[PDB]
């Protein structure tokens, strides 16, 4: 999805 | 303060390539998606490309797919747009735009928040050329209620801009220097007009001063009244 | 692809007025709609996001409404800082913009002063002739300018340019330039600029005969 979050995932591992 | 500063714009011949850059500051660049958006003269705002924060995903408008590529260098806080096979429809102001930032990721779909001021790209085969400057003389035709209109036609120059002054800057009230128009020849043209008291036309000289820095030309044209 | 349409294209208003502008999406975009403010030569500024949520620092007089295909922006009491062009943007399916709504300063109707300038002898020496028609200090912006050469309406050989609204008196000025080769200019006699404008009860013509 182009419109999905394109920033760092705040919940990344 | 979130700041985005584009660079790299200028004249490029059709079919050629040009790389734009955007220097990001005042936020963590490596955490943000980024966009390019353009505005072609006489058209609307047009989204061009997006790139993910980590460079792993990127999407393009149909109108540039296969010709433009977006990339980034997070260690240098820089966004890039590599353009190729450029054509006149790509002449535009190009803006660096940050994807909407949300540290809590509240929503599922993302727009854009902060824009840079833009860099201008002009795709043209025209050669650098200073303008010819012609008088628009006042007459009885140019005279309306104690007021006369006169001007100078600033024709056939490339690229933008020219600057026009009157009487070396001493005359500024009543001046309209119109936006330039692109002619079918690929050269620009504009007029600068000024309205003055008709009572002054016999005792005050009117000279338009035209500066075109890309060609290192400066032209003065005295505009002489007509007895007709 | 989703198309956004704004209306009106231009809105004339005064300080203190309530102003509402509209945005329509060609297909549903739910709440994924943003409003930006743009002033001439300056970067757009995001004002409303998620259709109704004001961004930080955006004054309380702004409000956004709508969900689905019809959206509005309202300014409850217009302030001088609010004269600008407003663009909507959907961010549901890629990103597309409306054509924008210019909110301009209202003033009383003012007819243009019309002037016509024949080509200079200096220009004719070089083989081109430009005839300039000037519409000075008029309001509203809408004007129709037509060229007639030997009483024949011209097509394709003129271009217009218009100023931004004047900061002091809220008028516009406009040029229309007719460009002909020297050979074409010399084939005809009568050159006429015809101007239609709300401030004129009937169209005004300025004309000359080549060589007078």
Author numbering:
A (entry chain Q): 3 to 15
B (entry chain A): 1 to 52, 52A, 53 to 82, 82A, 82B, 82C, 83 to 100, 100A, ...
C (entry chain B): 1 to 94, 96 to 213
What's in the article?
The 10 mAbs that exhibited high affinity for the major repeat and varying degrees of cross-reactivity induced two distinct conformations in the antigen. Comparison of the 1210- and MGG4-like binding modes revealed that the N-core conformation was largely dictated by the HCDR3. All seven 1210-like mAbs contained a bulky Lys or Tyr residue six positions from the end of the HCDR3 (termed here position HCDR3(-6)) that directly occluded the MGG4-like conformation through steric hindrance. The presence of an HCDR3(-6) Lys/Tyr appeared to correlate with IGHJ gene usage because all seven 1210-like mAbs were encoded by IGHJ6∗02, where Tyr is the GL-encoded HCDR3(-6) residue40. Ky15.10 and Ky315 had lower binding affinities to junctional peptides KQPA and NPDP compared with the five 1210-like mAbs with an HCDR3(-6) Lys residue. This suggests that the Lys residue facilitates high-affinity binding to junctional epitopes where DPNA is present in the N-core, which aligns with the register by which the 1210-like mAbs bind KQPA and NPDP. We also noted that 1210-like mAbs bind peptides derived from the PfCSP junction (KQPA and NPDP) with a preferred register that positions the major NANP repeat in the center of the epitope between the N- and C-core motifs.
As the most abundant surface protein expressed by Pf sporozoites and with essential roles in parasite development and invasion, Pf circumsporozoite protein (PfCSP) is a major target for biomedical interventions. PfCSP is composed of three domains: an N-terminal domain that undergoes proteolytic cleavage prior to hepatocyte invasion; a polymorphic, T cell epitope-containing C-terminal domain; and a conserved central region largely composed of consecutive major NANP repeat motifs. In total, 22 antibody fragment (Fab)-antigen complex structures were solved at 1.54- to 2.95-Å resolution to gain insights into whether differences in potency are associated with different features of PfCSP repeat recognition.
